Design a protein around this ligand. Structure first.
Ligand code: 3PE
Ligand code: PLC
Lengths: 64, 130
């Protein structure tokens, strides 16, 4: 009833609720929001590919 | 006529008649819990809105905007003199016409009573002066 729930249903439910609540705030009809994300993605073309894992770490920081 | 809750001088809350069935929806839930478990945070979630703007009875407070009101006033070649014709237009389409007169009211009828019949005659020269 302890660690196997934290690393199981109860723990993953809290993780899912936290992550899904973040994603629910990103779906709203707004021109400025989607334009910023489109233009931001252009940096993947500019950046050298070795920086992908740093962008991955930065994105996980923003989830918090 | 009378200031009511859904209609007054400054705004109205217009609702159309509902063409569709009054469908009942109860027990709203997601895959992580019921609606009441997250309804506190659902104000930030646009996908959690229970009221649809296409519904005929959706509440909208609309300010009562004056329609395009034009003074076709005395200083205008169309008006044959002094006529403050007030027109409420929809673009150029006339919706209501309010002719304001008295800009040439000179009290001829009042003045005539103070004149003899011979003296009052020239007043008639100046009513329809063509
Ligand atoms: C033997 C059985 C084996 C099977 C088990 C396998 C699952 C093991 C994983 C266990 C880890 C999840 C369980 C513990 C998570 C608990 C989440 C949580 O409590 O939220 C923490 C915090 C929000 O704070 P709050 O919960 O409100 O209060 C603090 C309570 N002390 O918010 C947080 O800090 C959460 C961290 C933010 C989210 C980080 C996201 C990282 C990337 C997602 C992780 C999964 C990656 C999957 C990738 C593919 C997905 C398609
Ligand atoms: C890889 C090694 C083998 C592991 C096999 C898979 C086990 C997965 C954990 C069980 C989850 C479960 O059963 O999901 C069912 C549970 C039910 O939760 P509940 O008891 O109703 O409490 C929840 C409600 N409360 C707290 C209010 C009472 O829904 C959840 O929590 C939703 C989160 C789903 C996450 C699923 C991700 C699975 C990833 C698997 C690989 C990491």
């Amino acid at each position: 009833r302890g660690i196997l729930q934290l690393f199981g249903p109860l723990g993953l439910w809290k993780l899912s609720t936290f992550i899904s609540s973040k994603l629910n705030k990103l779906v709203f009809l707004n021109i400025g929001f989607i334009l910023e994300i489109i233009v931001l993605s252009w940096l993947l073309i500019v950046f050298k590919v070795s920086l992908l894992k740093y962008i991955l770490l930065l994105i996980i920081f923003i989830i918090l | 006529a009378a200031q009511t809750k859904d209609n007054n001088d400054f705004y109205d809350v217009k609702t159309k008649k509902n063409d569709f069935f009054p469908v009942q929806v109860d027990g709203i839930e997601s895959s992580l819990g019921k609606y009441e478990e997250f309804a506190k945070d659902a104000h930030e979630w646009e996908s959690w809105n229970l009221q649809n703007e296409d519904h005929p009875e959706y509440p909208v407070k609309r300010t009562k905007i004056r329609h395009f009101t034009l003074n076709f006033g005395p200083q205008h070649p169309a008006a044959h003199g002094v006529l403050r014709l007030i027109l409420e237009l929809h673009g150029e389409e006339i919706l209501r016409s309010d002719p304001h007169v008295g800009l040439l009211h000179r009290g001829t009828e009042k003045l005539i009573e103070s004149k003899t019949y011979m003296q009052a005659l020239p007043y008639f020269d100046r009513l329809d002066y063509v």
